Amino acid sequence: SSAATETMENVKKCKNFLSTLIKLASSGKQSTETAANVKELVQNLLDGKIEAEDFTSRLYRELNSSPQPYLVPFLKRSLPALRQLTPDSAAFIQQSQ
């Protein structure tokens, strides 16, 4: 409801989004190369090495998935806060498994 409450909820949703991707990618119904690639996309995003548009483009290619029109703006508004909250990307990845 407040801007602050909205921000915090977006952050939690975005954590859940990235951690689900890792869980899916790491499930072993998936190719070992895909899993490493999704882990690396998520880590680079979290480390600020890539930005939302390029992460989503590469993700759709990696998973052979279809585009989501609200996904980039969601990420763009959540990532600055989540990043400040997520000082160790490797540990986040490890924790999502």
Binding region for its own copies (CB under 8 A): 13-14, 16-17, 20-21, 24, 27-33, 35-36, 57, 59-61, 63-71, 74
- How far is C-alpha 57 from the geometric centre of its chain's CA atoms? 13
State how far the Cα of 48 lies from the Cα of 13, in Å rounded to an integer.
19
- How far is C-alpha 34 from the geometric centre of its chain's CA atoms? 15
Q: What's the closest the beta carbon of residue 77 comes to its own copies, in angstroms?
A: 11
Nearer to its own copies, 2 or 66 (CB): 66
Q: What's the closest the beta carbon of residue 62 comes to its own copies, in angstroms?
A: 10
Q: What's the closest the beta carbon of residue 84 comes to its own copies, in angstroms?
A: 20
CA-based nearest residue to 78, from 22, 23, 6: 6
Nearer to its own copies, 29 or 87 (CB): 29
What is the crossing angle of helices 3-25 and 71-84, to 10°?
Answer: 100
